Amino acid sequence: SLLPVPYTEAASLSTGSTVTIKGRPLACFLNEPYLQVDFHTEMKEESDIVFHFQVCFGRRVVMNSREYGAWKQQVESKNMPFQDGQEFELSISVLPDKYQVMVNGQSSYTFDHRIKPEAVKMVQVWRDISLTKFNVSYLK
Amino acid sequence: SLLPVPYTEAASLSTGSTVTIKGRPLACFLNEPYLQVDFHTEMKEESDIVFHFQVCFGRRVVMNSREYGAWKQQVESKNMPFQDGQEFELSISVLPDKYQVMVNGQSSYTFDHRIKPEAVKMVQVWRDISLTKFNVSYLK
């Protein structure tokens, strides 16, 4: 019942869209497994990234965009709602002005739009997790 | 013909041992896939690490040890013999005073022993690679 990782799915997003991801780190937090979610402008993996979300479990989260191939201003958070050894549910909601990232139902990170979410054509979920669910939903 | 990743194998090392690893990154270098090789003191993943070798492909390599659960002095190298999109052969040779890391036959990194290599009981290879070969050999 596991999805392949790296996991890539075509996607369209607008205000009211939510990307929901259920999975589990492949290692204990002492080993610093990573999780990465990238919202890309094209299906190709080297395409620009409207929203990059990277967890180093137990340490920090970084967020950024990659525009014309170059990483822009990095944002860092030390908020760490993820729990060592546990399955997590991560949801990324598209609001008018930002993405909101919920972890296990708790608001945990936000990132103001640098590019309209309508530029997204693909989502990739990768690094040191197993994945059981990936869903894009919409509520107006 | 791919080996499972994370890949864990029991191992014993001394002067003259070589760990040889063939694999390929799972992403283009622009996406910064990682590779990690850890020489552990016990079979459990949370055990201490005599030699930690972490590649961020296209950017840098860090090396360290984890002793009584704590990371020690990080060493960083910007040497990057790995080639974007290519299979690599990595060998880690145990010398009297250090590990020598060869990449595609070229001496690329070294790390002085902080703990005797005889303390190693397990090797783990993980992060964003596919793996086709893992071998421990010995030449006196």
Swiss-Prot record, chains A, B:
Keyword set includes Acetylation: yes
Entries under InterPro entries matching the protein: ConA-like_dom_sf, Galectin-like, Galectin_CRD
Tissue: Expressed abundantly in the bone marrow. Expressed exclusively by eosinophils and basophils. Not detected in monocytes and neutrophils. Expressed in CD25-positive regulatory T-cells (Treg) (at protein level). Found in intestinal tissue from patients with Celiac disease, expression is directly related to the histological grade of mucosal damage and to the number of eosinophils found in the duodenal lesion (at protein level). Found in sputum of patients with eosinophilic inflammatory diseases such as asthma (at protein level).
Assigned keywords, A-Z: Acetylation, Cytoplasm, Lectin
Cytoplasm recorded as keyword: yes
A GO BP entry: regulation of activated T cell proliferation
Note: Forms hexagonal bipyramidal crystals, known as Charcot-Leyden crystals, in tissues and secretions from sites of eosinophil-associated inflammation and some myeloid leukemias.
Role according to the record: Regulates immune responses through the recognition of cell-surface glycans. Essential for the anergy and suppressive function of CD25-positive regulatory T-cells (Treg).
Identification of the protein by name: Galectin-10
